[PDB]
Amino acid sequence: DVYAQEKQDFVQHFSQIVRVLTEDEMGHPEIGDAIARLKEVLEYNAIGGKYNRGLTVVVAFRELVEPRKQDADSLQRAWTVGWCVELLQAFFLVADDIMDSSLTRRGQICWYQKPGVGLDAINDANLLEACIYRLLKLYCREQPYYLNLIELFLQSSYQTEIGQTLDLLTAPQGNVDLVRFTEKRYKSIVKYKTAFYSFYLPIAAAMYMAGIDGEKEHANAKKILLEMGEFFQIQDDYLDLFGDPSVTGKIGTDIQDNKCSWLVVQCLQRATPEQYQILKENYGQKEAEKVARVKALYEELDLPAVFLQYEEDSYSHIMALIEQYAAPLPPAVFLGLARKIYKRRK
Amino acid sequence: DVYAQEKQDFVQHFSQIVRVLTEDEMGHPEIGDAIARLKEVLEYNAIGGKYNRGLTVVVAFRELVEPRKQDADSLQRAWTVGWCVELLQAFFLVADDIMDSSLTRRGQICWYQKPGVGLDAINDANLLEACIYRLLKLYCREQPYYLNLIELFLQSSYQTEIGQTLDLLTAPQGNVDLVRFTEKRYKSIVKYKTAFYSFYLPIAAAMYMAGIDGEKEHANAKKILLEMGEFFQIQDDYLDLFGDPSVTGKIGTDIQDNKCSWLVVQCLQRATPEQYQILKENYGQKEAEKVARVKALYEELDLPAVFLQYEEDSYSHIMALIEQYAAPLPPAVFLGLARKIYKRRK
Numbered sequence: 001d002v003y004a005q006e007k008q009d010f011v012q013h014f015s016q017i018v019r020v021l022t023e024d025e026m027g028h029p030e031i032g033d034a035i036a037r038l039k040e041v042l043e044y045n046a047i048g049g050k051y052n053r054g055l056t057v058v059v060a061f062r063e064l065v066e067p068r069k070q071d072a073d074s075l076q077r078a079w080t081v082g083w084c085v086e087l088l089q090a091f092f093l094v095a096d097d098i099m100d101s102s103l104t105r106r107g108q109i110c111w112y113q114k115p116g117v118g119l120d121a122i123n124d125a126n127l128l129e130a131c132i133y134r135l136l137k138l139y140c141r142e143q144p145y146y147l148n149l150i151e152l153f154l155q156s157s158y159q160t161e162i163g164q165t166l167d168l169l170t171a172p173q174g175n176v177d178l179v180r181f182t183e184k185r186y187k188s189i190v191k192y193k194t195a196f197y198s199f200y201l202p203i204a205a206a207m208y209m210a211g212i213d214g215e216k217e218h219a220n221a222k223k224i225l226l227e228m229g230e231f232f233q234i235q236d237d238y239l240d241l242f243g244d245p246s247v248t249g250k251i252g253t254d255i256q257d258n259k260c261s262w263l264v265v266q267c268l269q270r271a272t273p274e275q276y277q278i279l280k281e282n283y284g285q286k287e288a289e290k291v292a293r294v295k296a297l298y299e300e301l302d303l304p305a306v307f308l309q310y311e312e313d314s315y316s317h318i319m320a321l322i323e324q325y326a327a328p329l330p331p332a333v334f335l336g337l338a339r340k341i342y343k344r345r346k
Numbered sequence: 347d348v349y350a351q352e353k354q355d356f357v358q359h360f361s362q363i364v365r366v367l368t369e370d371e372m373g374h375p376e377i378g379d380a381i382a383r384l385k386e387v388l389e390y391n392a393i394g395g396k397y398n399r400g401l402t403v404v405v406a407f408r409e410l411v412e413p414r415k416q417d418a419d420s421l422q423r424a425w426t427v428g429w430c431v432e433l434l435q436a437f438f439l440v441a442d443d444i445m446d447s448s449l450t451r452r453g454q455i456c457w458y459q460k461p462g463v464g465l466d467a468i469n470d471a472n473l474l475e476a477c478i479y480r481l482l483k484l485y486c487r488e489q490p491y492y493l494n495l496i497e498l499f500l501q502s503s504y505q506t507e508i509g510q511t512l513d514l515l516t517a518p519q520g521n522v523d524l525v526r527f528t529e530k531r532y533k534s535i536v537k538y539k540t541a542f543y544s545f546y547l548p549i550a551a552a553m554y555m556a557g558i559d560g561e562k563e564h565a566n567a568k569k570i571l572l573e574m575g576e577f578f579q580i581q582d583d584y585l586d587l588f589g590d591p592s593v594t595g596k597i598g599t600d601i602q603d604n605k606c607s608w609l610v611v612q613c614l615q616r617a618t619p620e621q622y623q624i625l626k627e628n629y630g631q632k633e634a635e636k637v638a639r640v641k642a643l644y645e646e647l648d649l650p651a652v653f654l655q656y657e658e659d660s661y662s663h664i665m666a667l668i669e670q671y672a673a674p675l676p677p678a679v680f681l682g683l684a685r686k687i688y689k690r691r692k
């Protein structure tokens with residue numbers, strides 16, 4: 001309910017993001033064509049998702065700032081910082097779709113796969129990242145949390161690029177080595193690639209906006225949010241193979257891209273050495289027959305049932321973590337976000 | 347002479363950049379393999395160039411800071427900010443080589459063209475950009491110019507991505523339209539894509555480090571440096587076709603990539619309508635015969651002689667600009683940089 005009620009206002013206020021990013025550079029008409037390319041990149045790549053991450057900034061801002069201090073202006077700042085998280089997301093996905101050789105995202109063909117786009121998408125992704133800091137400057141330059149916000153977005157992008165390097169190093173194409181797909185490797189990838197920017201970044205932006213900047217409170221929040229990010233990435237892995245791509249909005253590639261998925265880790269931990277070899281022969285290869293052979297091994301080992309058991313235990317554990325670590329922040333902030341990701345099918 | 351004397355110290359101190367970026371994240375051993383990938387990216391992509399841009403930071407810092415304030419520590423900061431400019435450069439070139447489909451850079455194959463690299467180079471480029479802000483934090487966090495430095499590197503990357511969009515929009519592959527290659531378009535591309543980061547960025551970093559942060563002094567410096575950047579990019583265009591690739595360290599692609607080069611603008615301005623059509627039929631295409639036909643048109647129109655005339659007039663003009671705008675900064679700062687780029691063959 002809390003996410004669903006703020007949605008509308010948050011989405012409507014994307015026109016303004018687009019205007020402020022296009023308008024404040026028409027005192028420079030020579031870049032006009034670039035500005036129009038920017039708008040086209042924003043509209044195709046920041047729109048059409050669920051907005052969980054940016055909505056989180058706005059929800060937690062209401063819940064943490066005293067209503068006497070929710071003036072029209074500090075609200076406007078809140079949904080801008082929210083949009084900055086949506087722009088970080090857009091930047092990582094556009095690049096990620098190239099590196100993953102993916103086909104669709106959010107119901108449409110991937111940006112790079114569009115006629116006349118291709119690898120120009122690389123500079124388009126870098127421009128989306130640039131917008132974040134332009135926004136921060138335009139809306140938040142005179143706020144006492146300004147430098148905290150800048151350092152947070154930069155630190156969060158470095159961690160996520162470190163996690164991406166791990167994702168890629170662990171998945172060399174044409175190079176099946178099942179030995180490297182362990183639980184410890186897995187947890188490291190997902191912590192870096194997904195957990196800091198999807199879960200720590202947004203609540204923490206909102207903390208810094210409410211004046212809550214203590215080390216110890218940031219660490220306690222981080223303890224909850226990183227375990228949630230781990231679950232959330234294990235969920236994304238499961239949906240790559242078994243979700244319905246008209247719900248997820250994307251076709252799966254993990255088996256073909258030779259990925260250290262949660263599924264292949266769970267597989268490897270249960271496999272007869274005969275099953276092992278079937279995995280070995282069929283994994284990380286573009287042939288549909290061969291992907292279907294892996295999928296069939298996974299179903300033979302009840303990996304869907306194991307995913308549903310893990311979802312429940314992970315959820316009880318996250319809840320225990322909230323009871324331990326939420327104070328002095330209102331638990332509603334952690335609970336509202338957990339509700340939105342619990343048993344998602346997209 | 348001034349560049350040549352600081353070189354050694356500047357280069358030697360790259361081991362330290364590499365150590366500080368690898369060491370201060372081994373309290374996190376799970377990212378070990380990513381850290382090693384980072385070192386490999388740094389060594390292949392920040393090393394082997396002339397270091398003009400980073401050396402500029404260090405040279406202008408000596409020339410602008412009072413020697414009583416050139417303590418061992420503020421010097422160390424100076425050659426770090428220098429290296430941050432070399433890392434911005436490395437980030438743009440790695441991406442640019444993909445978008446340009448280039449073959450070599452600085453005497454070796456392009457990063458993305460290395461066996462086992464490919465499009466993973468996209469995340470490698472984004473990591474190189476991340477390092478800049480990690481450095482700024484590690485060395486400069488408590489300096490009064492810290493936030494000026496952060497905003498400068500970010501603003502300079504946005505401008506250069508705007509210029510890249512223009513570079514790419516003006517060069518759609520498979521789409522010969524000679525109508526868009528004008529002088530005004532050209533000047534706009536080069537101002538954004540090259541001039542702010544190669545020329546304004548480094549002197550200005552050094553200004554902010556010496557306490558010189560006035561609007562008006564920054565604008566005056568900018569007036570000189572942007573015209574120098576324009577010349578410098580016109581030079582790079584000329585070398586793409588007529589430089590010797592054992593000096594430049596790179597094979598040219600401008601004709602094949604359908605580029606708004608200086609050469610094609612000068613061509614279009616002198617061409618008989620018969621010459622025009624030869625250009626039209628042969629431009630922006632991968633066939634060697636067809637590139638050689640364009641090259642031969644260019645030589646038939648004395649474009650090499652016109653380049654040498656422009657080099658001289660541009661140089662006299664830059665010098666006039668220094669006489670007008672250099673004060674209260676020592677002219678040595680502008681003169682030393684102009685000497686290093688005047689009649690370069692790489």
Ligand SMILES: CCCCn1cc[n+](CC(O)(P(=O)(O)O)P(=O)(O)O)c1
Binds near residue numbers: 164193194236237
């Ligand atoms: C650069 C940012 C790295 C984090 N990142 C990127 C994409 N995803 C989710 C994916 O699950 P991934 O390719 O599987 O990790 P997707 O299913 O493609 O959306 C997370």
Ligand SMILES: CCCCn1cc[n+](CC(O)(P(=O)(O)O)P(=O)(O)O)c1
Binds near residue numbers: 506586
């Ligand atoms: C993203 C940064 C845009 C600025 N940029 C990139 C490369 N160069 C110089 C080149 O001249 P370009 O491809 O010709 O413009 P190169 O000969 O390839 O080194 C400038």
Ligand SMILES: [Mg+2]
Binds near residue numbers: 096100102
């Ligand atoms: Mg992906």
Ligand SMILES: [Mg+2]
Binds near residue numbers: 096100167
């Ligand atoms: Mg991925």
Ligand SMILES: [Mg+2]
Binds near residue numbers: 236237240
């Ligand atoms: Mg996925």
Ligand SMILES: [Mg+2]
Binds near residue numbers: 442443446448
């Ligand atoms: Mg290039």
Ligand SMILES: [Mg+2]
Binds near residue numbers: 442513
């Ligand atoms: Mg280029």
Ligand SMILES: [Mg+2]
Binds near residue numbers: 582583586
């Ligand atoms: Mg060039």
